[PDB]
Design a protein around this ligand. Sequence first.
Ligand code: HEM
Length: 152
Amino acid sequence: GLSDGEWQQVLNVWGKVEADIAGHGQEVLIRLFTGHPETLEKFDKFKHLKTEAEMKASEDLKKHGTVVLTALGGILKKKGHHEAELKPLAQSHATKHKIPIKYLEFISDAIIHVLHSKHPGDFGADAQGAMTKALELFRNDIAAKYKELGFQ
Ligand code: HEM
């Protein structure tokens, strides 16, 4: 649960992402894969990437970063009223992709890391607080659907 002022911070931060969605999405995925190599094994279409240079050169990885961040941005713009947008993603990630909730924690922290890396000194303490709370709400509502499905 976020206040109006917190949602305003989230959507202000998101404007930074929307100016270069593919570059942000690329770096989020590279941070996830290099920090947590077990996550790469969930992607049949990326498991061939062995080095970070290959990851950086991959146009399909940048494409997938755009897909991921476009979906997240659509959810965030709902300011918590995201049941319809979140349900299919929870269902596909539990039943088809088999993504443990831990990996959604990993990607949440990776988003925070990338924002500081690309906007150093321009991602203030209030903005980090609000973004973190928004990613926690997203993860928590996915977790409720995972529990319904019995997925661990
Ligand atoms: C911010 C969180 C994330 C968002 C918004 C997101 C969004 C999406 C979207 C929109 C798709 C395509 C449609 C679908 O299959 O439902 C997708 C596919 C996928 N997601 Fe996620 N995702 C997230 C986190 C992750 C994480 C943490 C993992 C794994 C570590 C992951 C693994 C996958 C895989 C395996 C696919 C299928 C890729 C394919 O082969 O083309 N997702 N995701």
